[PDB]
Ligand binder design. Structure first.
Ligand code: ZN
Ligand code: ZN
Ligand code: ZN
Length: 178
C-alpha cells in the first residue's frame, strides 16, 4: 500500500485498501472510511467493479439523460467519486469551506455553496437526482467567477471547474464531441 493519502498526499493515520494499493485518511475518503469490513475496498475499486459488471455502461451518454437519473446506489457512488476527484486537486482548498464576501465593488452571491456543504448533502441523501448534485457543484465555480470579476484569482474557479467537468465526462461516460 501507499504511505500517503491518495486525496491530500500527506502521511498520517491511513486506512489501506485491500484490493488496490491506495490509502486514505478517514475523512478524505468519501464516504468516510467504514468502521469494520475486512476486507475493505475503496471507492476507486468500487467504481471499477460497476464498470466490469456492466461494460456497456461505458458507451457514450447524453448529459441531459445523465442529469435526470435518480440517485440510486450506483449514481450516489458515482457522485461521491466525482466529489472525491475534485478534493484530490490541491486547489480545492479554496472552495472547501464556507466562504465570506466583502470586497469593494462586489456583492456576495445569493446562494453560497462550498464543497463541504455538498459533501454533507450527499452524506445525508439530500439529492434525489444527479442534477441536484451537479447544479450545486457548478454553482460553486459560478459564484466565484461572478464575485472576483476581473481579479486574476477568478482563474482558480476556471481551473477547478475544468477538473470537475473532465471527471464528470469520464465517470458518467458522456459521449465524446468536437
Ligand atoms: Zn488525506
Ligand atoms: Zn482500492
Ligand atoms: Zn451488463
Amino acid at each position: 500500500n501507499s504511505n500517503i493519502c491518495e486525496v491530500c498526499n500527506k502521511w498520517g493515520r491511513l486506512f489501506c485498501c485491500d484490493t488496490c494499493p491506495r490509502s486514505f485518511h478517514e475523512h478524505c475518503h468519501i464516504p468516510s472510511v467504514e468502521a469494520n469490513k475486512n476486507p475493505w475496498s475503496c471507492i476507486f475499486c468500487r467504481i471499477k467493479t460497476i464498470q466490469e459488471r456492466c461494460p456497456e455502461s461505458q458507451s457514450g451518454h447524453q448529459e441531459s439523460e445523465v442529469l435526470m437519473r435518480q440517485m440510486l446506489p450506483e449514481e450516489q457512488l458515482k457522485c461521491e467519486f466525482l466529489l472525491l476527484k475534485v478534493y484530490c486537486d490541491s486547489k480545492s482548498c479554496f472552495f472547501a469551506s464556507e466562504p465570506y464576501y466583502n470586497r469593494e465593488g462586489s456583492q456576495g452571491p445569493q446562494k453560497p455553496m462550498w464543497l463541504n456543504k455538498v459533501k454533507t448533502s450527499l452524506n445525508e441523501q439530500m439529492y434525489t437526482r444527479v442534477e441536484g448534485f451537479v447544479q450545486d457543484m457548478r454553482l460553486i465555480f459560478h459564484n466565484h467567477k461572478e464575485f472576483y470579476r476581473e481579479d486574476k484569482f477568478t482563474r482558480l474557479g476556471i481551473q477547478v471547474q475544468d477538473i470537475f467537468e473532465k471527471n464528470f465526462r469520464n465517470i458518467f461516460a458522456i459521449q465524446e464531441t468536437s
